[PDB]
Protein backbone atom coordinates (compact mmCIF):
# COMPACT_ATOMS: atom_id res chain seq x y z
CA UNK A 1 0.00 0.00 0.00
CA UNK A 2 0.76 3.74 -0.11
CA UNK A 3 -0.25 6.92 0.87
CA UNK A 4 -0.02 10.69 -0.58
CA UNK A 5 -1.50 13.58 1.51
CA UNK A 6 -0.85 17.11 0.59
CA UNK A 7 0.62 19.44 3.75
CA UNK A 8 0.11 23.05 3.74
CA UNK A 9 1.45 26.08 5.84
CA UNK A 10 -0.70 27.34 8.83
CA UNK A 11 0.25 30.73 7.84
CA UNK A 12 2.45 33.10 5.29
CA UNK A 13 5.57 32.24 7.59
CA UNK A 14 5.51 28.74 7.64
CA UNK A 15 5.36 28.70 11.00
CA UNK A 16 4.27 24.62 10.75
CA UNK A 17 2.46 22.68 8.31
CA UNK A 18 -1.09 20.80 8.63
CA UNK A 19 -2.12 17.77 6.94
CA UNK A 20 -5.74 16.30 7.12
CA UNK A 21 -6.07 12.89 8.60
CA UNK A 22 -9.12 10.63 8.81
CA UNK A 23 -10.15 9.12 11.94
CA UNK A 24 -12.65 7.39 13.15
CA UNK A 25 -15.85 5.76 11.02
CA UNK A 26 -17.55 7.65 9.80
CA UNK A 27 -14.35 9.24 9.17
CA UNK A 28 -13.70 12.99 11.35
CA UNK A 29 -11.47 14.63 9.67
CA UNK A 30 -8.51 16.61 11.23
CA UNK A 31 -5.39 19.11 10.34
CA UNK A 32 -2.43 18.09 12.40
CA UNK A 33 0.70 18.60 12.39
CA UNK A 34 3.15 16.11 11.39
CA UNK A 35 6.08 16.23 13.66
CA UNK A 36 9.38 13.58 12.93
CA UNK A 37 10.55 14.94 16.06
CA UNK A 38 7.87 13.37 18.31
CA UNK A 39 6.00 10.24 18.50
CA UNK A 40 2.09 10.70 20.13
CA UNK A 41 -0.91 10.66 17.79
CA UNK A 42 -2.96 13.32 19.79
CA UNK A 43 -5.79 15.07 19.19
CA UNK A 44 -7.94 17.69 20.28
CA UNK A 45 -10.96 15.99 21.51
CA UNK A 46 -14.54 16.14 23.25
CA UNK A 47 -12.25 15.81 26.12
CA UNK A 48 -10.41 18.82 25.67
CA UNK A 49 -11.17 21.32 28.70
CA UNK A 50 -14.01 23.52 27.20
CA UNK A 51 -11.69 26.76 28.35
CA UNK A 52 -8.21 25.14 26.15
CA UNK A 53 -10.52 24.76 22.85
CA UNK A 54 -10.70 27.70 20.61
CA UNK A 55 -11.32 27.30 17.12
CA UNK A 56 -9.96 23.79 16.86
CA UNK A 57 -11.71 21.29 15.26
CA UNK A 58 -12.33 18.06 17.90
CA UNK A 59 -12.41 14.34 17.78
CA UNK A 60 -15.69 12.93 19.33
CA UNK A 61 -14.92 9.12 20.11
CA UNK A 62 -18.40 8.42 21.24
CA UNK A 63 -19.43 9.07 17.31
CA UNK A 64 -17.23 6.46 15.68
CA UNK A 65 -18.22 3.13 15.44
CA UNK A 66 -14.77 1.53 15.51
CA UNK A 67 -13.30 3.63 18.26
CA UNK A 68 -12.40 1.59 21.48
CA UNK A 69 -10.94 3.11 25.01
CA UNK A 70 -7.51 1.77 25.84
CA UNK A 71 -8.03 0.52 29.32
CA UNK A 72 -6.52 2.19 32.01
CA UNK A 73 -3.90 4.28 29.26
CA UNK A 74 -2.62 7.89 30.11
CA UNK A 75 -0.25 9.71 28.05
CA UNK A 76 1.66 13.18 29.14
CA UNK A 77 4.29 15.39 26.87
CA UNK A 78 6.23 18.50 26.85
CA UNK A 79 7.66 19.06 24.05
CA UNK A 80 11.04 21.42 23.70
CA UNK A 81 9.37 24.79 23.64
CA UNK A 82 7.97 24.34 26.86
CA UNK A 83 4.27 23.65 25.38
CA UNK A 84 2.48 20.89 26.80
CA UNK A 85 -0.81 17.96 26.57
CA UNK A 86 -1.90 15.33 27.99
CA UNK A 87 -5.16 12.91 28.31
CA UNK A 88 -5.98 9.37 27.83
CA UNK A 89 -6.42 6.38 24.98
CA UNK A 90 -8.75 5.46 22.20
CA UNK A 91 -7.81 3.13 19.11
CA UNK A 92 -9.30 4.06 15.96
CA UNK A 93 -8.91 4.16 12.43
CA UNK A 94 -6.43 6.45 10.77
CA UNK A 95 -6.52 7.29 7.46
CA UNK A 96 -3.01 9.49 5.65
CA UNK A 97 -3.80 10.10 2.18
CA UNK A 98 -5.56 6.96 1.28
CA UNK A 99 -3.10 4.82 3.87
CA UNK A 100 -5.27 3.36 6.53
CA UNK A 101 -4.33 1.38 9.71
CA UNK A 102 -6.65 -0.13 12.04
CA UNK A 103 -6.21 0.08 15.77
CA UNK A 104 -4.30 3.24 15.88
CA UNK A 105 -3.47 4.55 19.47
CA UNK A 106 -5.68 7.89 18.73
CA UNK A 107 -4.45 9.76 22.47
CA UNK A 108 -7.27 12.22 23.26
CA UNK A 109 -6.43 15.74 25.04
CA UNK A 110 -8.26 16.26 28.03
CA UNK A 111 -5.66 19.34 29.08
CA UNK A 112 -3.25 21.39 26.23
CA UNK A 113 -1.15 24.38 27.29
CA UNK A 114 -1.88 27.86 26.13
CA UNK A 115 0.48 27.86 22.83
CA UNK A 116 -1.79 25.26 21.57
CA UNK A 117 -5.09 26.53 22.86
CA UNK A 118 -4.14 30.00 20.96
CA UNK A 119 -3.24 28.13 17.44
CA UNK A 120 -6.69 27.67 16.40
CA UNK A 121 -5.17 26.25 12.58
CA UNK A 122 -3.23 23.16 14.64
CA UNK A 123 -6.00 20.45 15.61
CA UNK A 124 -3.56 18.01 17.15
CA UNK A 125 0.35 16.61 16.61
CA UNK A 126 0.70 13.07 14.46
CA UNK A 127 4.72 11.66 15.79
CA UNK A 128 6.56 10.61 13.17
CA UNK A 129 9.94 9.85 15.56
CA UNK A 130 10.83 6.05 16.94
CA UNK A 131 8.20 4.79 18.42
CA UNK A 132 10.35 4.25 21.69
CA UNK A 133 9.93 8.34 22.33
CA UNK A 134 6.15 7.58 22.83
CA UNK A 135 4.55 8.67 25.96
CA UNK A 136 1.32 6.34 26.80
CA UNK A 137 1.29 4.60 29.80
CA UNK A 138 1.50 2.20 31.30
CA UNK A 139 1.51 -0.03 27.47
CA UNK A 140 3.52 2.49 25.13
CA UNK A 141 1.91 2.47 21.72
CA UNK A 142 3.54 2.31 18.40
CA UNK A 143 3.21 5.61 16.02
CA UNK A 144 1.34 5.63 12.69
CA UNK A 145 4.16 5.07 10.79
CA UNK A 146 5.15 2.16 12.88
CA UNK A 147 1.70 0.41 12.64
CA UNK A 148 1.93 0.86 8.29
CA UNK A 149 5.64 -0.18 7.74
CA UNK A 150 4.78 -3.89 7.40
CA UNK A 151 2.22 -2.98 4.65
CA UNK A 152 3.94 -0.61 2.55
CA UNK A 153 5.28 -1.19 -0.47
CA UNK A 154 8.83 -0.01 1.11
CA UNK A 155 9.10 0.53 4.39
CA UNK A 156 9.68 4.89 4.18
CA UNK A 157 7.84 8.22 4.00
CA UNK A 158 8.91 11.06 2.54
CA UNK A 159 8.71 15.09 3.41
CA UNK A 160 8.34 17.72 0.76
CA UNK A 161 7.89 20.48 2.69
CA UNK A 162 6.75 24.10 0.53
CA UNK A 163 8.24 27.62 1.03
CA UNK A 164 5.12 29.84 1.10
CA UNK A 165 3.31 26.99 -0.58
CA UNK A 166 1.81 23.55 -0.08
CA UNK A 167 3.57 19.94 -0.58
CA UNK A 168 3.42 16.67 0.51
CA UNK A 169 3.60 13.82 2.61
CA UNK A 170 4.17 10.01 0.85
CA UNK A 171 4.02 7.03 2.32
CA UNK A 172 5.83 3.77 0.82
CA UNK A 173 7.19 5.16 -2.38
CA UNK A 174 9.26 7.87 -3.29
CA UNK A 175 7.64 10.19 -6.03
CA UNK A 176 11.41 10.16 -8.41
CA UNK A 177 9.38 13.65 -10.39
CA UNK A 178 9.76 15.37 -7.16
CA UNK A 179 13.22 16.19 -6.79
CA UNK A 180 16.31 16.94 -8.89
CA UNK A 181 19.41 14.88 -9.29
CA UNK A 182 20.20 12.21 -7.00
CA UNK A 183 19.26 11.45 -3.04
CA UNK A 184 22.26 11.00 -1.07
CA UNK A 185 21.72 8.90 2.10
CA UNK A 186 23.24 9.22 5.43
CA UNK A 187 23.12 7.25 8.57
CA UNK A 188 20.83 7.58 11.03
CA UNK A 189 21.30 6.79 14.91
CA UNK A 190 18.10 6.10 17.03
CA UNK A 191 19.82 6.06 20.35
CA UNK A 192 17.60 9.36 21.21
CA UNK A 193 14.27 8.22 19.48
CA UNK A 194 15.24 10.68 17.00
CA UNK A 195 15.89 10.64 12.87
CA UNK A 196 19.61 11.73 14.42
CA UNK A 197 22.60 12.43 11.76
CA UNK A 198 25.23 14.37 11.04
CA UNK A 199 25.53 17.11 8.48
CA UNK A 200 28.96 17.29 7.03
CA UNK A 201 29.82 20.83 6.91
CA UNK A 202 28.18 24.21 5.97
CA UNK A 203 28.23 27.25 3.69
CA UNK A 204 27.48 30.82 3.91
CA UNK A 205 26.53 32.50 0.74
CA UNK A 206 29.19 31.60 -1.62
CA UNK A 207 31.64 31.46 0.87
CA UNK A 208 33.77 28.32 1.10
CA UNK A 209 32.52 25.49 2.23
CA UNK A 210 33.63 24.33 5.88
CA UNK A 211 34.12 20.48 6.64
CA UNK A 212 32.81 20.20 10.64
CA UNK A 213 30.40 17.37 11.86
CA UNK A 214 27.01 18.80 13.01
CA UNK A 215 25.12 16.23 14.73
CA UNK A 216 21.45 17.14 14.78
CA UNK A 217 18.03 15.88 13.98
CA UNK A 218 15.72 15.95 11.42
CA UNK A 219 12.40 17.68 12.56
CA UNK A 220 9.26 18.41 10.66
CA UNK A 221 7.94 19.70 13.73
CA UNK A 222 10.27 22.36 14.73
CA UNK A 223 9.93 25.69 12.88
CA UNK A 224 13.37 26.86 12.58
CA UNK A 225 17.26 25.47 11.86
CA UNK A 226 18.73 25.77 15.35
CA UNK A 227 22.89 25.14 14.91
CA UNK A 228 25.71 25.95 17.28
CA UNK A 229 26.58 28.74 17.94
CA UNK A 230 29.87 29.33 15.87
CA UNK A 231 28.07 28.23 12.77
CA UNK A 232 25.17 31.03 13.39
CA UNK A 233 27.58 33.65 14.32
CA UNK A 234 29.33 32.98 11.28
CA UNK A 235 25.90 33.15 9.58
CA UNK A 236 24.46 36.48 11.25
CA UNK A 237 27.88 37.88 10.84
CA UNK A 238 27.27 38.74 6.93
CA UNK A 239 24.04 40.43 7.24
CA UNK A 240 24.47 44.40 8.04
CA UNK A 241 23.21 45.42 11.54
CA UNK A 242 21.87 41.57 12.50
CA UNK A 243 22.37 41.40 16.29
CA UNK A 244 21.35 38.45 18.80
CA UNK A 245 18.61 40.20 20.87
CA UNK A 246 18.28 38.65 24.87
CA UNK A 247 14.74 40.45 25.08
CA UNK A 248 13.41 39.21 21.42
CA UNK A 249 14.75 36.19 22.15
CA UNK A 250 17.48 35.23 19.32
CA UNK A 251 18.70 36.88 15.95
CA UNK A 252 17.27 39.78 14.48
CA UNK A 253 18.45 41.47 11.37
CA UNK A 254 16.90 45.13 9.70
CA UNK A 255 13.68 43.86 7.19
CA UNK A 256 15.24 46.21 4.58
CA UNK A 257 18.26 43.33 4.55
CA UNK A 258 18.83 40.78 1.81
CA UNK A 259 19.61 37.65 3.45
CA UNK A 260 22.26 35.01 2.43
CA UNK A 261 21.67 32.03 1.56
CA UNK A 262 22.77 28.77 3.80
CA UNK A 263 24.45 25.67 2.62
CA UNK A 264 24.81 22.25 4.46
CA UNK A 265 26.38 18.91 3.69
CA UNK A 266 24.82 15.72 3.23
CA UNK A 267 27.55 13.47 2.69
CA UNK A 268 29.32 14.72 -0.36
CA UNK A 269 26.29 16.98 -1.36
CA UNK A 270 25.04 20.24 -0.43
CA UNK A 271 21.59 21.23 0.63
CA UNK A 272 21.28 25.31 -0.55
CA UNK A 273 18.16 26.73 1.56
CA UNK A 274 17.60 30.17 -0.14
CA UNK A 275 18.14 33.68 1.80
CA UNK A 276 14.21 34.17 1.58
CA UNK A 277 13.76 31.24 3.74
CA UNK A 278 15.09 32.42 6.42
CA UNK A 279 12.90 35.50 7.18
CA UNK A 280 10.34 35.20 9.55
CA UNK A 281 9.23 39.02 9.53
CA UNK A 282 8.61 41.97 12.07
CA UNK A 283 9.22 40.92 15.66
CA UNK A 284 6.35 42.33 16.12
CA UNK A 285 3.55 44.27 13.95
CA UNK A 286 4.58 47.32 12.13
CA UNK A 287 8.54 46.60 13.39
CA UNK A 288 11.65 47.03 11.16
CA UNK A 289 13.56 44.88 12.89
CA UNK A 290 12.67 41.00 11.97
CA UNK A 291 13.00 37.49 13.13
CA UNK A 292 16.00 35.25 11.58
CA UNK A 293 15.36 31.35 10.55
CA UNK A 294 18.44 30.81 11.64
CA UNK A 295 18.71 30.66 15.41
CA UNK A 296 21.47 29.22 18.06
CA UNK A 297 20.71 26.01 20.13
CA UNK A 298 23.14 26.43 22.75
CA UNK A 299 20.72 25.45 25.90
CA UNK A 300 18.30 23.21 23.74
CA UNK A 301 21.38 20.51 23.84
CA UNK A 302 20.79 19.12 20.59
CA UNK A 303 20.61 20.87 17.02
CA UNK A 304 17.73 21.02 14.94
CA UNK A 305 17.49 20.79 11.23
CA UNK A 306 13.69 21.91 11.44
CA UNK A 307 11.47 23.31 9.01
CA UNK A 308 13.48 26.26 7.36
CA UNK A 309 16.14 23.31 6.62
CA UNK A 310 13.89 20.47 5.25
CA UNK A 311 11.86 22.53 3.16
CA UNK A 312 15.34 23.03 0.88
CA UNK A 313 14.92 19.82 0.36
CA UNK A 314 13.10 16.24 -0.51
CA UNK A 315 13.80 14.27 2.21
CA UNK A 316 13.49 10.32 2.73
CA UNK A 317 13.00 8.91 5.74
CA UNK A 318 13.81 5.34 5.84
CA UNK A 319 12.42 3.00 8.14
CA UNK A 320 14.25 -0.38 6.89
CA UNK A 321 15.88 -2.32 9.60
CA UNK A 322 18.69 -0.12 9.45
CA UNK A 323 17.10 3.31 9.37
CA UNK A 324 18.76 6.31 7.02
CA UNK A 325 17.57 9.93 5.83
CA UNK A 326 18.18 10.98 2.23
CA UNK A 327 18.13 14.30 1.53
CA UNK A 328 17.99 15.70 -2.49
CA UNK A 329 17.70 18.93 -3.94
CA UNK A 330 14.34 20.34 -5.60
Given at each position: ?159 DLGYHAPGTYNFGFIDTTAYTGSITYTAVSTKQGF ?106 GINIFGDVALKAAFVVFNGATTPTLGFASK
Amino acid sequence: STGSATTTPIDSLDDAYITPVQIGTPAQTLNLDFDTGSSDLWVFSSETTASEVDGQTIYTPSKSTTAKLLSGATWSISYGDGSSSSGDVYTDTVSVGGLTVTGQAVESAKKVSSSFTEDSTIDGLLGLAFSTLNTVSPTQQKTFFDNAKASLDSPVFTADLGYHAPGTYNFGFIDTTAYTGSITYTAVSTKQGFWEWTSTGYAVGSGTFKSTSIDGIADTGTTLLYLPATVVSAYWAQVSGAKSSSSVGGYVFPCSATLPSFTFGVGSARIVIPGDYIDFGPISTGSSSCFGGIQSSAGIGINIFGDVALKAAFVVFNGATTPTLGFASK
